[model samples]
Target: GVKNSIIWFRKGLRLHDNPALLEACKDAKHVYPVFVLDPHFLQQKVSVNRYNFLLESLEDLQRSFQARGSRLLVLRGKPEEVFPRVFREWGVTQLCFEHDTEPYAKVRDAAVRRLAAEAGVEVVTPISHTLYDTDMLVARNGGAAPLTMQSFTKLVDRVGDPPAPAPDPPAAMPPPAEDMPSAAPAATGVPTWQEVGFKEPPLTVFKGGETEALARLEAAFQDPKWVAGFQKPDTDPSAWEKPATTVLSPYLKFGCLSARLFHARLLEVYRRHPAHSQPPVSLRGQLLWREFFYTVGSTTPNFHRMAGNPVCKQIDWDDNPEFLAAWREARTGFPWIDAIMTQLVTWGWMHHLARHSVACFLTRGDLYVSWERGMEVFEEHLIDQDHYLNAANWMWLSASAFFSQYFRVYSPVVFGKKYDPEGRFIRKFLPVLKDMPAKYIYEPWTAPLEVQRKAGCVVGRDYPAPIVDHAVASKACIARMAAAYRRSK
Candidate 1:
């Protein structure tokens, strides 16, 4: 008796080729696409950046649904309390929606499923967020999982054929009943910088929406200025400068557009490129780096629970409040280190290269402080942030991921010498350092006292000196990372 039903939308928020919606339409005679603003999401401290993106996605979705005959039914309150009331009013028999990967979401979905079962309504959940399910990627050798990127990518490459686009759902959907819990609507509160809890949105460069996401994708393909740049060998190899990279991570995180659509778009462009002379495979691997984390997140419920490795379980990591303050404010004497941290604080996004450098810089002590802490900080501000990948990679860099052998720590000075050879990257993030000589820009303390005076700054007084000596910090890092690996065996 699946007479009427609800498509309880979760993360997957688009109309184009949605797999779950297609399944729901096969059974239900009447369908209402309901988006519940659960009180829990408000209370649980979802990052302001992600919340803003989710709000924009919902706004776009609402407009799209309204264009057709159906309207997105907005609901409030917990699923347990709200649904029985809704079922009685609307007379719906079932619920269907896409799945989510975060820890809180799993618990919430489990509770919703149980309550829906008790109410004699069915709950259907599907995986639309991931290119491939986590279980599908687990090794056939079946001892432990591949914890290194090389092994991870190999497994992914074996299983992943470039997937065809998910076919679109039927043109027509069932109408909502007029009598169904028809209460007066609340004003559509489109999120702002304040609403998303940003004092002001930190990332001036990033925008969140399906419309803008698609536009960026189009520009990456069509715009001569940007597209030509994508093909050029950018000096920073670790950064995503290749045409293979999409500037679409923010939208992907919020489900404004499906990951499938993103892949499909990549294929669209790649096919247009002359075969055997186009962008290479390493570029394609960047997208998979994203999927690899989601795979870990879905299968390993404890993916975010502990540090990545057992060696880390024993170390007494430092929690120096003064050091933390220096790192956060970009006053760390290591100029390139300061630049990366400052960019994180101001922009809420950093190139992947900057991400690697900053994380290595932080885990310099006993490796005891959890990557979870850093992931949480990044999650709060990162426009490109997705939970599974963010948590996984942080743990991986922290040496939490079991298979990785490199307990590598980057030297702040060496990093500066290599990545920002002329100190251009530093001056952009730290404008106060602009007048300092290019020679002393990367290490201001090295400047002659006369030169420092001319630059209008003193190393220790006007701008802070290095928090901990970089050389000393480097030795400490080597010892800690060595300890982490030795203890692991």
Candidate 2:
């Protein structure tokens, strides 16, 4: 019944723990592996930095397939229109792919699957991207999502441990037809940044692909004691020269790294040391926090927006493009904030708490723009831009959903000073303020005119002045959120 099948690659980009790829090979005479480069997504929020990462990931997959005497067929079109044509021409009897959890992907897959069935082609989909079949996880929680971390974990306890990672696929596969589809970007390997309509990205700290991912994973966890005692909150965000965490979020996002493999490795380390840090702050706890967001992301209607989102608290966020642009362009005048933004645009990543200060400033803390606007900026720049995780954190930071501690605003000045008291981080990114004295480094506006001249940069001249007075704006925001909560209740 399954003579020839097509293996559609999406989030599950790596061969290790790839159940879908393995499924495509079982009992099939030929497997045509394909990856669609959807033009619809080509012009959207996916950034050039992310595009470069995607290209690298694809090229790696191509190499793997080439070594196995198969090729990754790179197609360009909407999948709805694509599958029917491929089925007709290739005599495809079945299709298999890794399931996707995001709302956009679910609907797209549904249409494609339906098209396959109408063509009498069977579809075999497996939950390889996320740790669990979130569809089942949500139904187990009474057909709704577990809202809090407490509830999410409790739900997990009831569902049992996730399935052990599927073994890596066997080293062989059926060859493509004699005159099959050409390779990605016309067999020149995956397209370069320029060919894909993207400018060369700024230098990045991380590389993409499973090889780089596994190398980083191996190197990062070499010290078992460090792995056992790792606490997310204790990690140094200001240690930008050497990132304090695994920096594996991008790999996990692109499926260049397997989350289950990551979880299993943490377990192996924790088993050796009973003193391993636990969830919420511990490294293991952070993995579940990731699960928590995806579970909610799958259930929360309008997970990506503010309006009509059941989990989203409807606050009257301001519409201020000038304030938004100032924040995005790294000219907010607060040295800490500007430095963080500069790092983001330059490197396509920042430490998580660095994100906290900036998101707070954008939403409930100062500028008062919607977190939707803030999240979009991250989607534009972050290499690790998991749409689900991005939305959840933005909502939490804005105090617009999940977390509601609106009164606890992050002081742009004090927050960075705690992590980087010497202003080494700020100086590295915002060198204009490099010569400023430490005492006035965080708040250059307070520096005396002589001090500004001595530093060779002046607030409102060489650097921007703080766009919103943090004390006034934060207090006002607290009142506004308080009012909104009162009304919602």
Candidate 3:
């Protein structure tokens, strides 16, 4: 006797491969597809670019639903308050949504589930956000998360292959019942950036939605030669004219594309060609690293913080406000570090190696700042930020967990020089250093006063001088890290 149901949208925004939508349509004569715009997400210190991307995705989703003779109901409030009201008013007999594993989501989803039971509504939450259900994997592994990529891959293999992406979306949806309240114009239309209280920024290199996501996937496979020979380490971070790797992360972060579908596409190429690269260095390897981090973050409490976390190595770090502020403002006084930070602030994205260089410089390399400080900046700025990936990457870069070669540090001057000897990346981001000669572009402080003036940029005046001596600072940091690791053991 099911009359109506609600399909609550969280991360799974697209129509295809959506288990909640499929389930909500099965037993109910009518289904209300809804998206709750929680104040917590809107009020956070998130970048404007990420916010715009989400808005664009919502508009695209609305169009898709419109074509099917329905619209996405955009509500504002906590899920606990919204769901209970919808159940009582819309006569919703069932509630369905995709499973979410992040810490906040775990608590939020539990509250809704409790309310659903109280209201006598059936709940169906299927595995859609990840290639495999991480919670189930954790349970099967005796309550411990996979510690390394190798171990995580072993578990993936043991589970066999991931289930294929759900079948194509139904062509039409059951229209909302007459008894349901009519959605306001504001609830149907995507909110403007100003409405969300964000000063609208210029568009980024990426546009969000399933249409763009699918097109990028198709284009990536169009160049079989590139796909076959892809290697993560070999990709040039300084190549701005043409991005070396697939720029698909932002799309994946917003759930515009299915991870399982992407994996299947990669496997098709690998099976057909067999000469393509393999994991750990291959494109597939990068996805496995993402999966590894998700699995860890799913199980580990306080995964983002060094304090109270058993896996993270506890280290006393310098809490210099000036140093931390410099790192965030791209005034680190190191040209290479400054350039990378500039790109991150401007574009809300950076190449992975660039991320490595800045992250290391902030923590064990020179500044000796805590990894948490760097991670917070990334969370606020990155357009492709995922809670699990950001925390895991910061930890990895700081040598706090997962990675342990504390002595290895990226030389700010040498690393960028190796990739772009002409200082193209530096000049592009730091226009003040554009006239500096290639020899001193990576280290403008080393240029003679005459040379600096001749370049039309003064070392200490136009640009800041080196903040710290790399060799001196990094050596001391490594010694301290070694002592901390010993004490933790």
Q: How well is each residue in 292-348 modelled by candidate 2, as lDDT tens digits?
A: 899888877899998889889888899999999999999888888888888888788
How well does candidate 3 score on lDDT at residue 257? 86
Which pairs of residues collide in candidate 3? none
Cα misplacement distance, residue 484 of candidate 1 (Å): 3.0
In candidate 2, position 235 carries an lDDT of 83
lDDT per residue, candidate 3, 1-489, as tens digits?
666888888788788888888888885688888888865666547888888888888888889988998778888877888788888888888888888888889899999999999999989999988888888788878888889887887888888788898887678888676545545655555786778777667446778888888998998999877887899988898987777888888888888888888888888888878789977888888888888888888778888788888788888988988899989998878888999898887888888988999999999889999998888899888889999999888888999898999889999889989889989999998999899999899888889999999999888799987888998998999999988889985
Model 1 per-residue lDDT tens digits across residues 1-489: 556778887777777656777766776677778777654555453445556666667778767766666677667666667777777666667778888767778788888877777778777777777776665567542745565567776776677654555787666676566644443345223344464344645343566666777787676657433333343224362332341345567777767667776677665555555341223233345567677666556666566656443322334457666665566667777778778877776656677657777776676432334466667767766766776778766766666564254445666767657655667777777777888988888778999999889988788877778777766766776677677667856
By summed lDDT, which 10 consecutive residues of candidate 3 come out lowest? Answer: 179-188
Clashes of each: 2, 1, 0
Query: How does model 2 fare in lDDT?
Result: 0.85
RMSD of 2: 1.8
* Weakest 10 consecutive residues of candidate 2 by summed lDDT: 180-189
